[PDB]
Amino acid sequence: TAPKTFTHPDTGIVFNTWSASDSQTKGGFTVGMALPSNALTTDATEFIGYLECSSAKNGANSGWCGVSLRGAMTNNLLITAWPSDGEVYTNLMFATGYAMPKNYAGDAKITQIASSVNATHFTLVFRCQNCLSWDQDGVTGGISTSNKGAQLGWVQAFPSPGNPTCPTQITLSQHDNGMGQWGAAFDSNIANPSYTAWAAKATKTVTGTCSGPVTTSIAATPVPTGVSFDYIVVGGGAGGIPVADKLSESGKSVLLIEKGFASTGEHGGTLKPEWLNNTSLTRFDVPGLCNQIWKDSDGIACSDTDQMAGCVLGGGTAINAGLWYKPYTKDWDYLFPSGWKGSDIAGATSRALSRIPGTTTPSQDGKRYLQQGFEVLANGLKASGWKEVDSLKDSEQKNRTFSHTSYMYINGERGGPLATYLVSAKKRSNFKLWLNTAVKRVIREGGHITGVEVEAFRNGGYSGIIPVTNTTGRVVLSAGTFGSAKILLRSGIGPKDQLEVVKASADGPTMVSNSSWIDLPVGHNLVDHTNTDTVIQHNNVTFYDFYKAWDNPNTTDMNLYLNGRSGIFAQAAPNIGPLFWEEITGADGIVRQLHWTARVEGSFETPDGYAMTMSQYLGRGATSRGRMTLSPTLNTVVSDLPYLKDPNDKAAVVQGIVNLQKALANVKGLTWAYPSANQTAADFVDKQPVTYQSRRSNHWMGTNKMGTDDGRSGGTAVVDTNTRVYGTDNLYVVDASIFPGVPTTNPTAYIVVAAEHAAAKILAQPANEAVPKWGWCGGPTYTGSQTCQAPYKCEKQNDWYWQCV
Ligand SMILES: Cc1cc2nc3c(=O)[nH]c(=O)nc-3n(C[C@H](O)[C@H](O)[C@H](O)COP(=O)(O)OP(=O)(O)OC[C@H]3O[C@@H](n4cnc5c(N)ncnc54)[C@H](O)[C@@H]3O)c2cc1C
Ligand code: HEM
Ligand SMILES: *[C@@H]1O[C@H](CO)[C@@H](O)[C@H](O)[C@H]1NC(C)=O
Ligand SMILES: *[C@@H]1O[C@H](CO)[C@@H](O)[C@H](O)[C@H]1NC(C)=O
Ligand SMILES: *[C@@H]1O[C@H](CO)[C@@H](O)[C@H](O)[C@H]1NC(C)=O
Ligand SMILES: *[C@@H]1O[C@H](CO)[C@@H](O)[C@H](O)[C@H]1NC(C)=O
Ligand SMILES: *[C@@H]1O[C@H](CO)[C@@H](O)[C@H](O)[C@H]1NC(C)=O
Ligand SMILES: *[C@@H]1O[C@H](CO)[C@@H](O)[C@H](O)[C@H]1NC(C)=O
Ligand SMILES: *[C@@H]1O[C@H](CO)[C@@H](O)[C@H](O)[C@H]1NC(C)=O
Ligand SMILES: *[C@H]1O[C@H](CO)[C@@H](O)[C@H](O)[C@@H]1O
Ligand SMILES: *[C@H]1O[C@H](CO)[C@@H](O)[C@H](O)[C@@H]1O
Ligand SMILES: [Mg+2]
Ligand SMILES: [Mg+2]
Ligand SMILES: [Mg+2]
Ligand SMILES: [Pt+2]
Ligand SMILES: [Pt+2]
Ligand SMILES: [Pt+2]
Ligand SMILES: [Pt+2]
Ligand SMILES: [Pt+2]
Ligand SMILES: [Pt+2]
Ligand SMILES: [Pt+2]
Ligand SMILES: [Pt+2]
Ligand SMILES: [Pt+2]
Ligand SMILES: [Pt+2]
Ligand SMILES: [Pt+2]
Ligand SMILES: [Pt+2]
């Protein structure tokens, strides 16, 4: 009621002010008025206002202020204020009821003088012309300044307005932070001779912009207090899912964090073509729909990499063709160290094949479809003396061999880890699943990981830090070849220059200190199958589209799938003809594996129908390696290609094609589109560019290589034979990134088998125990526990020695 006098320090203007108490609102609220010289006698039509308002939390630019001029919200002119960008915006509103007020169409105008914004308050000094009398529709109101005083209402809110930069279009909910009104009465200072000079300082103006609605926000859930896990696995995928289940059989608490959203039907996925609406099936569930990922991939695939990777539950297993194979045991013999050889891995290979047996006849009616294309090549090959084997039992015949396509499917829908391992895991109470949640890095005190930092990627997901239960807790990185290498780098584990790139980013202030960095060759030894395409034609080739089966599917086949789980839709797009294999000895005395897959599709210039493309995959035995690195904002890039470096790698690719022509030489009516018949094989291979767009197989591997040679000693291995990161207590990597090289076939089978094997070694490892005072807690050769008994701290003594002190 009684006015406080307040002189503005900046502009020099004297206000009458009225404030609210600390109970009425928090952060505080103050109004002020400045009137003309004659104002205490005759009614003034204008005034100079002052607003000091509050931002409590949401606290940078947020909240809004209001004033009602005869004080009730209704049938009076409202003035509404709020910060955005660091400026202050206002709007003149008029409310009839106690719903959201409209814009005031009338002669009232606000022009600014001075403004302030900071973490506590936002200030405004403005000038209101023609604001003391109003009309809207049929409503007359006003206040007489000679009374002497006025009724004033006020409000304050916690959230900032929607469309906060476009005043005409703003969106509000009811005022949170407080409300009330005064009996405010005037005195000496509200009428000043200096007034008309004060109102010429109204020159200032603010720039609004409309631009439409906003998609940016991502509201998140903060991480539960007093919760921890025995194992935390990062990412659902070929490695992630199977390892999380097998850990969860132990009874220990397991959490699985995944950046993606729900993928298949069973797990709550919604993405479908318009003709799957009336079922629970989803585009990831139908095999014949699997190639649409090359047409519309948005939000399905990772934005932080220059390559194709699924960010969805099941990762690669959700977007791939589903090809499944009993692993060739020689691949383990050649690639892996001891404990991972063919004989050690035999146990876990049967366990994986029991949960996911795979099938050569995905259709549940019992036989195959559009096999005429398959037939041409199949018979043409045994004519040159090749041998049909079943790729699901004697896996040992990879030389001059073909087989029927073999999938991971179960009941004619996409099979694999999502349909088996992740179901039997969800049934358990210890198991928990978090989606739409990105892991930024692991948190660690020295070589011991305490917990992991998460950031909500999409809405459902979580922000903040989850701990592992202490001293025993373990983290497993399953986030894929590029994803896992990235997490390590951001965790201060990797080559120096890459860590510097991280330190120089927006991650840097919060990043681990470099006193604790671990030098490992993360990102080195990048490797991929080397893919090369050839094209043939025959009149026997039956083409099926599959791309417009999205929109306008064949009705006999749609009804055949939906009703019976049969028809062409139960096998992979595109229709995948025979798989065949050849091993080749080079002049360097290495045997390089070839893996051919044939699908009935057109390639570079050869139109679809009559056409079969034959993709050669250069596998195990290839010597060439690349490297992965980080962009300045921490995108993963392939800066060194692993394709056709060694001249003997290229020799084998060329050989393969020659041998294939000789073996298809006697077949009726067989064209060769590529290489065209005027062209030699070597000439063709050489015209193919060696570039990841031309030659990549999407089988990326090896960026944290497993080996017995510690990286910190100038060896090549990031993780040891138990899949644990050198220099660490609790930190493991289970996924394609540990493979020292590519296997014969498509890697998903090899990865799940490998996840089975690792979860057994991990579990077999003795519990971790804190190091006593004076004990050895670290340095470049140290393999033991990295954490001290409390209060004691790990401290560095030499350049080579850390002890608990
Ligand atoms: C286009 C394509 C086609 C393929 N076709 C075949 C095929 O026909 N046959 C075959 O056998 N294999 C195929 N694969 C290859 C095979 O799927 C991959 O090698 C396999 O998926 C590797 O599994 P992974 O667990 O190592 O990584 P992924 O399977 O990619 O799983 C990684 C998971 O971790 C999650 N993640 C990543 N970053 C984070 C983060 N920081 N925080 C939390 N979670 C994160 C990802 O979202 C993803 O879900 C294909 C792959 C692709 C990309
Ligand atoms: C959509 C946003 C808004 C909603 C839902 C809203 C709703 C309300 C409701 C329901 C009441 C009191 C209930 C009652 O009297 O029974 C109220 C009171 C009030 N409102 Fe509004 N309001 C909104 C925006 C504003 C604006 C823009 C102003 C003025 C700047 C404002 C100023 C007031 C004041 C001063 C009071 C207390 C005095 C009174 O009862 O009139 N509100 N608000
Ligand atoms: C923010 O501004 C308000 C008034 O405009 C002032 O009271 C407060 O001290 C300022 N905050 C800081 C941190 O200076
Ligand atoms: C399928 O569902 C989507 C989801 O809203 C809808 O947009 C589409 O029209 C539906 N198609 C039908 C019912 O044929
Ligand atoms: C082409 O198809 C016909 C029947 O459709 C078959 O008799 C013939 O053997 C096929 N050609 C080859 C090369 O298999
Ligand atoms: C693969 O088969 C070819 C042809 O029979 C033969 O020349 C080659 O030595 C074989 N390689 C191996 C490793 O058996
Ligand atoms: C660690 O960082 C500081 C600057 O942040 C730098 O001066 C120091 O040399 C770094 N340590 C090493 C070993 O380079
Ligand atoms: C749809 O597929 C069936 C085979 O199941 C075929 O007989 C029919 O002709 C196809 N329809 C069209 C329009 O091609
Ligand atoms: C587990 O945590 C507490 C507090 O964080 C610590 O004092 C205790 O020593 C830790 N466990 C062991 C075995 O030291
Ligand atoms: C985290 O918080 C969100 C709200 O933004 C919830 O919708 C979600 O269920 C999760 O618990
Ligand atoms: C973290 O805060 C939660 C609030 O949900 C409590 O339940 C818990 O005891 C801890 O203080
Ligand atoms: Mg309130
Ligand atoms: Mg494939
Ligand atoms: Mg770049
Ligand atoms: Pt006076
Ligand atoms: Pt505007
Ligand atoms: Pt929980
Ligand atoms: Pt869609
Ligand atoms: Pt060998
Ligand atoms: Pt469930
Ligand atoms: Pt913590
Ligand atoms: Pt149906
Ligand atoms: Pt080379
Ligand atoms: Pt591609
Ligand atoms: Pt074991
Ligand atoms: Pt070290």
Numbering used by the authors: 2 to 806
Paper's wording?
We observed that crystals of native, full-length NcCDH typically lacked interpretable density for the CYT domains. Data from one platinum-soaked crystal offered better-defined electron density for the CYT domains, which allowed us to model both NcCDH molecules in the asymmetric unit. The overall weak density for the CYT domains suggests significant flexibility in the linker regions. The two non-crystallographically (NCS)-related molecules are present as two ‘open' states with different conformations of the flexible linkers and different relative orientations of the CYT and DH domains. The haem b is fully exposed and accessible in both open-state models. The crystal and solution structures of two closely related class-II CDHs revealed pronounced flexibility of the linker between the CYT and DH domains to allow the efficient association of the haem b with both the FAD electron donor (closed state) and external protein electron acceptors such as LPMO (open states). Overall, NcCDH has fewer negative surface residues but displays a similar trend of negative charges clustering near the channel entrance.
An oxidative system was recently discovered in which extracellular flavocytochromes, that is, cellobiose dehydrogenases (CDHs), cooperate with copper-dependent lytic polysaccharide monooxygenases (LPMOs)8910111213 to catalyse redox-mediated glycosidic bond cleavage in crystalline cellulose, hemicelluloses and starch. CDHs are large flavocytochromes containing a haem b-binding cytochrome domain (CYT) connected by a long, flexible linker to a flavin adenine dinucleotide (FAD)-binding dehydrogenase domain (DH). The DH domain oxidizes cellobiose at the C1 position to cellobiono-1,5-lactone with reduction of FAD. The ensuing step involves inter-domain electron transfer (IET) from the reduced FAD to CYT haem b, presumably by single electron-transfer (ET) events, followed by ET from CYT to external electron acceptors such as LPMOs.
